[PDB]
Amino acid sequence: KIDACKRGDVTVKPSHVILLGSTVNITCSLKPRQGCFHYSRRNKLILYKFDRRINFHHGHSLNSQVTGLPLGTTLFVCKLACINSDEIQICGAEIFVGVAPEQPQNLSCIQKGEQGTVACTWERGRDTHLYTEYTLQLSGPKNLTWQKQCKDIYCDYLDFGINLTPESPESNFTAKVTAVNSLGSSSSLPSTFTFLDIVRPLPPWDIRIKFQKASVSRCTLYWRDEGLVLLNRLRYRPSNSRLWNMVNVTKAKGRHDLLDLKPFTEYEFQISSKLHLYKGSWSDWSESLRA
Amino acid sequence: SAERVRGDNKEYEYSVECQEDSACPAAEESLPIEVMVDAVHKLKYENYTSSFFIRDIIKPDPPKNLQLKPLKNSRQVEVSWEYPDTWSTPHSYFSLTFCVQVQGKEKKDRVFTDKTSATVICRKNASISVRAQDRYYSSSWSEWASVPC
Amino acid sequence: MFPCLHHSQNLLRAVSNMLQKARQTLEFYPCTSEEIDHEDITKDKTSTVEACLPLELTKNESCLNSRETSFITNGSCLASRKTSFMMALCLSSIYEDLKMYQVEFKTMNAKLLMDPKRQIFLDQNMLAVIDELMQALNFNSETVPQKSSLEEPDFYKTKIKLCILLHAFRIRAVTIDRVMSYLNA
Amino acid sequence: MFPCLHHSQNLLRAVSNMLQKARQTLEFYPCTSEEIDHEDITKDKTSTVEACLPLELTKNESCLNSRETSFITNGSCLASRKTSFMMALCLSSIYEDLKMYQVEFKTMNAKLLMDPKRQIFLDQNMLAVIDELMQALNFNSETVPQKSSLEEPDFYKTKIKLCILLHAFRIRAVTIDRVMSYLNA
Amino acid sequence: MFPCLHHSQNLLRAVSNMLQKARQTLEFYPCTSEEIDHEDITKDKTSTVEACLPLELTKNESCLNSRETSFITNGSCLASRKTSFMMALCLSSIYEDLKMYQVEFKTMNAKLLMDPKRQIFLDQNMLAVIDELMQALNFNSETVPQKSSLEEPDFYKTKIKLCILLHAFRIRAVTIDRVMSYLNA
Ligand SMILES: *[C@@H]1O[C@H](CO)[C@@H](O)[C@H](O)[C@H]1NC(C)=O
Ligand SMILES: *[C@@H]1O[C@H](CO)[C@@H](O)[C@H](O)[C@H]1NC(C)=O
Ligand SMILES: *[C@@H]1O[C@H](CO)[C@@H](O)[C@H](O)[C@H]1NC(C)=O
């Protein structure tokens, strides 16, 4: 059995993890068999924080009560100094000062495209100086559920690998995030999302410009995107200065008889689609098409 | 430009400022730039021709905003520096390598770090100095930037 | 021997076995060809019905509507400089047909698993064959993400829709097999 | 971290080690950067010199000559809908540059092996890195066939040509590395 | 060239880099060879100290204690009919030494990850090299299961134990390297 501390053992009261503001009783105790080979009233049993002397007792039992510890870890190492020999490190304690975990104030779940993996994002709050474990739970109408745990201390987001297929377009799904640390536990308020709110249409991948198969000013734009789109929007703004973009386009993959400027000067084109007008987010504008 | 006294001759240094006026940007150079100086003195005429590439003659200016930040309760000190504004942008396509020597006033404390922050134990009686060179190709080393430690 | 033709022959055989299992499992649900209407999900989205024809059969080219969905995705089944556009558009449309069906079949299977009993579930082997054929058809193959629901759907509706899709898919599988045989010979 | 950037960083390092070996092996043959002229085989065939630039640097777009060699081959290094055409043309041109060099390097290596002694031979690892990067750059990668000759060539000419190519290739390798770093950041 | 010798040379180099990182990370914790006692976990369990010797050095055979732990596990590093029992017992004992260390190193790493900060963590590459060498040493390799704890251990004790193990393991790594060199030559 490998043992880190052989000469003596050091105890901490109440524990290595303490609430910000508490006082720890670091006590260095030396086993009777171990000790300075020659008894002398010169040898000492020092205690050091970051190699800084805090106490010194000739006797094997050393007691200290450190206070006002800041957030972080402080290494208290208790070395033995003999009469002529160099100091031998005996044992030490690492103390993590921590505070109660922040509750996530805002939780949002976004699925990219009709086929996508749901991803939920939260505001962690102040960082407790402690290991942090995050649990994300998603439940449907009745209480079935999916849970995943983000063991990583810092998590940008947690993604449910399982895709969500909604039994009906109007359903209620509720998501909650729980943060647990040695000192305490904070749980976010339940947030209820309908499937349309979670889904976000993909930007239209395709784009084509045709001048109505003619030299005429009128232009026809042939783009392609996800099948379930009941709305759309197009940018007809002149390239040199942005002006106005039509709020809505008809449910046509291929634009027809769009009003375009008579010159053939290059014009930037951007396109967006809305899965549902009543409760669907707008898609990101498609890569600009030059001319 | 200057009137130094090498020996007793007092050599005088004359310099020209030349800018490539090519509008089209190009990733790599295939032709060396050629410079001709038609020196004229009284009734005597001489001409000198030099051929070179911009990357070969490039010499970076010293690293900017060098500051030392001691780590809490540790002997080592973190030192952070920033890219020179004069150097071409973006800083991703064109990159520099920083060599940090802590010898100040053991012979060679030079450490080559691509990162803009390195941590070096600081003896109270020495200075920490940083140098910049083109990371991609061998280039003339920059002037040392020294911050007292 | 054509490797894609072998995959297509495997596809038709896999659908034939799954269709036989479906009729045996759902005794009351009506799943005979006579009582099940023909409904094709890919009716307007893809041009397999027109583009996938022998070169002799297609001539006017007027009926190919403005190069409909002419993505012409390059793939390992053919070679880029090997065959005419009429077969290049056909291979892309066949890839799209398999993508539309696989996404739907996975959605049905995820709902079927929730059933307290296991009366019927889509054949994993048949789904794997569809994915393998798509990988050869187009290099930029997209693998469908695992689908699941947080609630329980009505099972009768899923079982009637399943029978309607299986029969329509079987007709599509023979159409793919005929094209693969033509490419080989 | 960008996987193609890691391959490009591996390429520049591999060329640097091979170039050092070449100078040590060929003591008499002149292989110092000063005595070796810069000659680029891909001078007119590819547009890497113009297309591969940071987006800020390229603006007029007039200098891109009529979309020269605008194959725009799709590949695993980028994603089809991820980056602007300026980087799509650049990745295709870089793939073409590596194809032109690999075909030539294999021809030189096959001639070098015939030498009664083994003074110098191209690094197998460097050739493998070039192939790996090309596979990521373009899905339709062509592997060069084993090259051999039925006669013995003059060796001095091959050793002078080798030094000229190695130095030019090293400059190309840094150019690829700069583009990969820009794509990552 | 011996493949196991290459793995052993990789092992010694990986430990050397990890040991340097450990000294830099733990500035206060004492991790210099002078202040760290030599303690070997495999002191009595395995006979590598005695069995792994050059054939010339070992003669009386009395010191081999009753074929201690004479499992003689067959493996891909040697061939079954290739070398004498003295090296067969040695290869088995080396496999056992790597198993005892890997199980312990994984336990330490699982405790280290819980630290609020990331001052130090065992090199994943070093652990992978240990597993690769064991796979060659014995066909019946057991992969250690992912280890985790439901509580938080004192970190100072783990960091002192870590330094004691790393230095002892480095001495073991040189001993394995010497045996692999002897097998090659
Ligand atoms: C610490 O120890 C002292 C004496 O041993 C005692 O008076 C005090 O109550 C202790 N405090 C804590 C927090 O344990
Ligand atoms: C679902 O869970 C919530 C909270 O646990 C509870 O209030 C509700 O009654 C549950 N519903 C059913 C049907 O069990
Ligand atoms: C979801 O909840 C809202 C408000 O709580 C309610 O109006 C709506 O009917 C619910 N939807 C379903 C399907 O129960």
mmCIF file with all atom_site columns, C-alpha atoms in Angstrom, chain D residues 39-125:
data_model
loop_
_atom_site.group_PDB
_atom_site.id
_atom_site.type_symbol
_atom_site.label_atom_id
_atom_site.label_alt_id
_atom_site.label_comp_id
_atom_site.label_asym_id
_atom_site.label_entity_id
_atom_site.label_seq_id
_atom_site.pdbx_PDB_ins_code
_atom_site.Cartn_x
_atom_site.Cartn_y
_atom_site.Cartn_z
_atom_site.occupancy
_atom_site.B_iso_or_equiv
_atom_site.pdbx_formal_charge
_atom_site.auth_seq_id
_atom_site.auth_comp_id
_atom_site.auth_asym_id
_atom_site.auth_atom_id
_atom_site.pdbx_PDB_model_num
ATOM 1  C CA . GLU D 1 39  ? 10.740  27.634 -60.616 1.00 0.00 ? 39  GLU D CA 1
ATOM 2  C CA . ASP D 1 40  ? 7.051   26.710 -60.042 1.00 0.00 ? 40  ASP D CA 1
ATOM 3  C CA . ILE D 1 41  ? 5.578   23.890 -62.198 1.00 0.00 ? 41  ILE D CA 1
ATOM 4  C CA . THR D 1 42  ? 2.014   25.047 -61.319 1.00 0.00 ? 42  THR D CA 1
ATOM 5  C CA . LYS D 1 43  ? 2.677   28.609 -62.600 1.00 0.00 ? 43  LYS D CA 1
ATOM 6  C CA . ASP D 1 44  ? -0.281  28.915 -64.993 1.00 0.00 ? 44  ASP D CA 1
ATOM 7  C CA . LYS D 1 45  ? -2.269  25.705 -64.468 1.00 0.00 ? 45  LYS D CA 1
ATOM 8  C CA . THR D 1 46  ? -3.737  26.640 -61.043 1.00 0.00 ? 46  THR D CA 1
ATOM 9  C CA . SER D 1 47  ? -5.061  29.846 -59.418 1.00 0.00 ? 47  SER D CA 1
ATOM 10 C CA . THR D 1 48  ? -3.819  29.195 -55.813 1.00 0.00 ? 48  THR D CA 1
ATOM 11 C CA . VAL D 1 49  ? -1.584  32.317 -56.095 1.00 0.00 ? 49  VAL D CA 1
ATOM 12 C CA . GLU D 1 50  ? -4.725  34.513 -56.530 1.00 0.00 ? 50  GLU D CA 1
ATOM 13 C CA . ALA D 1 51  ? -7.737  32.536 -55.146 1.00 0.00 ? 51  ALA D CA 1
ATOM 14 C CA . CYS D 1 52  ? -6.089  31.565 -51.803 1.00 0.00 ? 52  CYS D CA 1
ATOM 15 C CA . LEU D 1 53  ? -6.186  34.956 -49.989 1.00 0.00 ? 53  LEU D CA 1
ATOM 16 C CA . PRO D 1 54  ? -7.893  36.216 -46.766 1.00 0.00 ? 54  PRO D CA 1
ATOM 17 C CA . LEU D 1 55  ? -11.419 37.539 -47.561 1.00 0.00 ? 55  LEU D CA 1
ATOM 18 C CA . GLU D 1 56  ? -10.346 41.063 -46.434 1.00 0.00 ? 56  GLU D CA 1
ATOM 19 C CA . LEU D 1 57  ? -7.374  41.084 -48.896 1.00 0.00 ? 57  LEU D CA 1
ATOM 20 C CA . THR D 1 58  ? -9.418  40.117 -52.020 1.00 0.00 ? 58  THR D CA 1
ATOM 21 C CA . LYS D 1 59  ? -12.090 42.698 -53.028 1.00 0.00 ? 59  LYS D CA 1
ATOM 22 C CA . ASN D 1 60  ? -12.169 43.807 -56.724 1.00 0.00 ? 60  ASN D CA 1
ATOM 23 C CA . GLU D 1 61  ? -12.582 40.121 -57.786 1.00 0.00 ? 61  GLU D CA 1
ATOM 24 C CA . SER D 1 62  ? -11.539 41.375 -61.257 1.00 0.00 ? 62  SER D CA 1
ATOM 25 C CA . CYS D 1 63  ? -8.121  39.655 -60.834 1.00 0.00 ? 63  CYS D CA 1
ATOM 26 C CA . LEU D 1 64  ? -9.775  36.228 -60.388 1.00 0.00 ? 64  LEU D CA 1
ATOM 27 C CA . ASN D 1 65  ? -9.529  35.574 -64.171 1.00 0.00 ? 65  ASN D CA 1
ATOM 28 C CA . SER D 1 66  ? -12.962 34.407 -65.469 1.00 0.00 ? 66  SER D CA 1
ATOM 29 C CA . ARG D 1 67  ? -13.282 31.827 -62.621 1.00 0.00 ? 67  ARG D CA 1
ATOM 30 C CA . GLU D 1 68  ? -10.055 30.146 -63.884 1.00 0.00 ? 68  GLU D CA 1
ATOM 31 C CA . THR D 1 69  ? -10.145 26.321 -63.375 1.00 0.00 ? 69  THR D CA 1
ATOM 32 C CA . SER D 1 70  ? -13.331 26.855 -61.283 1.00 0.00 ? 70  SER D CA 1
ATOM 33 C CA . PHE D 1 71  ? -13.949 23.084 -60.774 1.00 0.00 ? 71  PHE D CA 1
ATOM 34 C CA . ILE D 1 72  ? -15.033 23.725 -57.117 1.00 0.00 ? 72  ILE D CA 1
ATOM 35 C CA . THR D 1 73  ? -14.608 20.022 -56.164 1.00 0.00 ? 73  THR D CA 1
ATOM 36 C CA . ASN D 1 74  ? -16.625 19.227 -52.997 1.00 0.00 ? 74  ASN D CA 1
ATOM 37 C CA . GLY D 1 75  ? -14.615 17.683 -50.144 1.00 0.00 ? 75  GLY D CA 1
ATOM 38 C CA . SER D 1 76  ? -14.384 16.581 -46.479 1.00 0.00 ? 76  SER D CA 1
ATOM 39 C CA . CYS D 1 77  ? -12.037 19.462 -45.509 1.00 0.00 ? 77  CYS D CA 1
ATOM 40 C CA . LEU D 1 78  ? -14.829 22.077 -45.646 1.00 0.00 ? 78  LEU D CA 1
ATOM 41 C CA . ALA D 1 79  ? -18.632 21.604 -45.694 1.00 0.00 ? 79  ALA D CA 1
ATOM 42 C CA . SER D 1 80  ? -20.640 22.298 -48.909 1.00 0.00 ? 80  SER D CA 1
ATOM 43 C CA . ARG D 1 81  ? -22.738 25.131 -47.339 1.00 0.00 ? 81  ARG D CA 1
ATOM 44 C CA . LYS D 1 82  ? -20.022 26.346 -44.906 1.00 0.00 ? 82  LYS D CA 1
ATOM 45 C CA . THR D 1 83  ? -17.657 28.821 -46.685 1.00 0.00 ? 83  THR D CA 1
ATOM 46 C CA . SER D 1 84  ? -17.611 31.426 -49.520 1.00 0.00 ? 84  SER D CA 1
ATOM 47 C CA . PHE D 1 85  ? -16.652 30.541 -53.127 1.00 0.00 ? 85  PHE D CA 1
ATOM 48 C CA . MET D 1 86  ? -13.318 32.348 -52.615 1.00 0.00 ? 86  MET D CA 1
ATOM 49 C CA . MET D 1 87  ? -12.222 29.511 -50.254 1.00 0.00 ? 87  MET D CA 1
ATOM 50 C CA . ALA D 1 88  ? -14.013 26.768 -52.289 1.00 0.00 ? 88  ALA D CA 1
ATOM 51 C CA . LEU D 1 89  ? -11.969 27.637 -55.434 1.00 0.00 ? 89  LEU D CA 1
ATOM 52 C CA . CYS D 1 90  ? -8.827  27.848 -53.235 1.00 0.00 ? 90  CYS D CA 1
ATOM 53 C CA . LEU D 1 91  ? -9.319  24.319 -51.778 1.00 0.00 ? 91  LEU D CA 1
ATOM 54 C CA . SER D 1 92  ? -9.802  22.867 -55.306 1.00 0.00 ? 92  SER D CA 1
ATOM 55 C CA . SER D 1 93  ? -6.637  24.665 -56.583 1.00 0.00 ? 93  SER D CA 1
ATOM 56 C CA . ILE D 1 94  ? -4.627  23.386 -53.538 1.00 0.00 ? 94  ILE D CA 1
ATOM 57 C CA . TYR D 1 95  ? -5.822  19.813 -54.346 1.00 0.00 ? 95  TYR D CA 1
ATOM 58 C CA . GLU D 1 96  ? -4.638  20.330 -57.969 1.00 0.00 ? 96  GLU D CA 1
ATOM 59 C CA . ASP D 1 97  ? -1.230  21.677 -56.762 1.00 0.00 ? 97  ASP D CA 1
ATOM 60 C CA . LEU D 1 98  ? -0.708  18.534 -54.616 1.00 0.00 ? 98  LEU D CA 1
ATOM 61 C CA . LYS D 1 99  ? -1.720  16.277 -57.564 1.00 0.00 ? 99  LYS D CA 1
ATOM 62 C CA . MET D 1 100 ? 0.801   17.975 -59.933 1.00 0.00 ? 100 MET D CA 1
ATOM 63 C CA . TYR D 1 101 ? 3.625   17.622 -57.342 1.00 0.00 ? 101 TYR D CA 1
ATOM 64 C CA . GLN D 1 102 ? 2.844   14.009 -56.239 1.00 0.00 ? 102 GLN D CA 1
ATOM 65 C CA . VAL D 1 103 ? 2.809   12.739 -59.883 1.00 0.00 ? 103 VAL D CA 1
ATOM 66 C CA . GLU D 1 104 ? 6.229   14.398 -60.457 1.00 0.00 ? 104 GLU D CA 1
ATOM 67 C CA . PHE D 1 105 ? 7.754   13.285 -57.095 1.00 0.00 ? 105 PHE D CA 1
ATOM 68 C CA . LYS D 1 106 ? 6.810   9.619  -57.783 1.00 0.00 ? 106 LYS D CA 1
ATOM 69 C CA . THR D 1 107 ? 8.463   9.849  -61.255 1.00 0.00 ? 107 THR D CA 1
ATOM 70 C CA . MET D 1 108 ? 11.701  11.192 -59.653 1.00 0.00 ? 108 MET D CA 1
ATOM 71 C CA . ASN D 1 109 ? 11.675  8.505  -56.890 1.00 0.00 ? 109 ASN D CA 1
ATOM 72 C CA . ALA D 1 110 ? 11.302  5.672  -59.465 1.00 0.00 ? 110 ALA D CA 1
ATOM 73 C CA . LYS D 1 111 ? 14.393  6.991  -61.343 1.00 0.00 ? 111 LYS D CA 1
ATOM 74 C CA . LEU D 1 112 ? 16.372  7.495  -58.051 1.00 0.00 ? 112 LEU D CA 1
ATOM 75 C CA . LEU D 1 113 ? 15.921  3.824  -56.921 1.00 0.00 ? 113 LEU D CA 1
ATOM 76 C CA . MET D 1 114 ? 17.852  2.532  -60.013 1.00 0.00 ? 114 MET D CA 1
ATOM 77 C CA . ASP D 1 115 ? 21.066  4.222  -58.685 1.00 0.00 ? 115 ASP D CA 1
ATOM 78 C CA . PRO D 1 116 ? 23.733  1.548  -57.841 1.00 0.00 ? 116 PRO D CA 1
ATOM 79 C CA . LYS D 1 117 ? 24.185  3.305  -54.437 1.00 0.00 ? 117 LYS D CA 1
ATOM 80 C CA . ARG D 1 118 ? 21.394  4.936  -52.356 1.00 0.00 ? 118 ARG D CA 1
ATOM 81 C CA . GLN D 1 119 ? 22.686  8.544  -52.044 1.00 0.00 ? 119 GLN D CA 1
ATOM 82 C CA . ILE D 1 120 ? 19.118  10.017 -51.816 1.00 0.00 ? 120 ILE D CA 1
ATOM 83 C CA . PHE D 1 121 ? 15.455  8.894  -52.271 1.00 0.00 ? 121 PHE D CA 1
ATOM 84 C CA . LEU D 1 122 ? 12.178  10.812 -51.650 1.00 0.00 ? 122 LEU D CA 1
ATOM 85 C CA . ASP D 1 123 ? 10.684  10.353 -48.129 1.00 0.00 ? 123 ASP D CA 1
ATOM 86 C CA . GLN D 1 124 ? 7.807   7.793  -48.240 1.00 0.00 ? 124 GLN D CA 1
ATOM 87 C CA . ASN D 1 125 ? 6.219   9.560  -45.210 1.00 0.00 ? 125 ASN D CA 1
#
